[PDB]
């Protein structure tokens, strides 16, 4: 199994490596918001993804706003369920503090510190855990140097007091697209990665060149959210551009999590409406996006 084989992950010269120092690449799925589609996040559905799709990482998208954790903290228990299922299935798991409408990570920074203190105290002695402290910082007034980096410099110390070196993914500006700025002003923690998010509906040649720039500065990049659709999560399925990005990520050995595991009627959703929330999906229960993503992970 994956975690038994690769064990402790770390960053070495800007690259994600296992405990023997070998490069590793994680490929999996992200849940949709846990406050809306939490029924698809359970041991059985995760086991089906592992066994039938070949996933080696699962991302628990805990929205903070929009009816998420700040409005009802009960969703933190669903994150715990996902983490424990990943531990039982021997796969990696990303704990995502999913900011979005609350566009500056500093808005709920005290709550984030308390949440990450609890999560790292509970699960800090497992190698499966990857922390994602701010999904998608966004807005012209939310910059890397003034807002995002200082936020990370307050939250990372909290995690590091309990868990010295599991991987931490830090969001970047402009909905986690501005890896150039983060790469030119990196954080001191040696086991940090910078998030890069893309949607296949957007022509991506310059964005690929921007990721290459960041990689050239020695910044480790995790594609913690990407979709086959347009940036809204809907608007069509763009498989030609998605395949270009898949090939690019393999060439650069970039780890990734696809958005998202839900039956919602939007192009990026991986499942069709009567898909069983506990897995075992037939061909007809997978959407065009989900069919493609499953093929990409099985091929790997
Ligand atoms: C990364 O990008 C994706 C795609 O844009 C984002 O996921 C989308 O987030 C939307 C906003 O949360 C979400 O729409 C919401 O869906 C809810 C559940 O159905 C509705 O109650 C709400 O009205 C609606 O705005 C899209 O369904 C989803 O794909 C992701 O959050 C970003 F990190």
Swiss-Prot record:
It is found in: Secreted. It catalyses: Endohydrolysis of (1->4)-beta-D-glucosidic linkages in cellulose, lichenin and cereal beta-D-glucans. GO terms for cellular component: extracellular region. Keywords: Carbohydrate metabolism, Cellulose degradation, Glycosidase, Hydrolase, Polysaccharide degradation, Secreted, Signal. The active site is at 136 (proton donor), 225 (nucleophile). It is an enzyme of class 3 (hydrolase). One of its GO terms (molecular function) is cellulase activity. The keyword Thylakoid does not apply. Its EC number is 3.2.1.4. Substrate binds at residues 32, 36-37, 63, 98, 199, 231-232, 259, 264-266. GO terms for biological process: cellulose catabolic process. Monomer. Belongs to the glycosyl hydrolase 5 (cellulase A) family. This is Endoglucanase 5A. It comes from Salipaludibacillus agaradhaerens (Bacillus agaradhaerens). The lineage of its organism: Bacteria, Bacillati, Bacillota, Bacilli, Bacillales. The gene is cel5A.
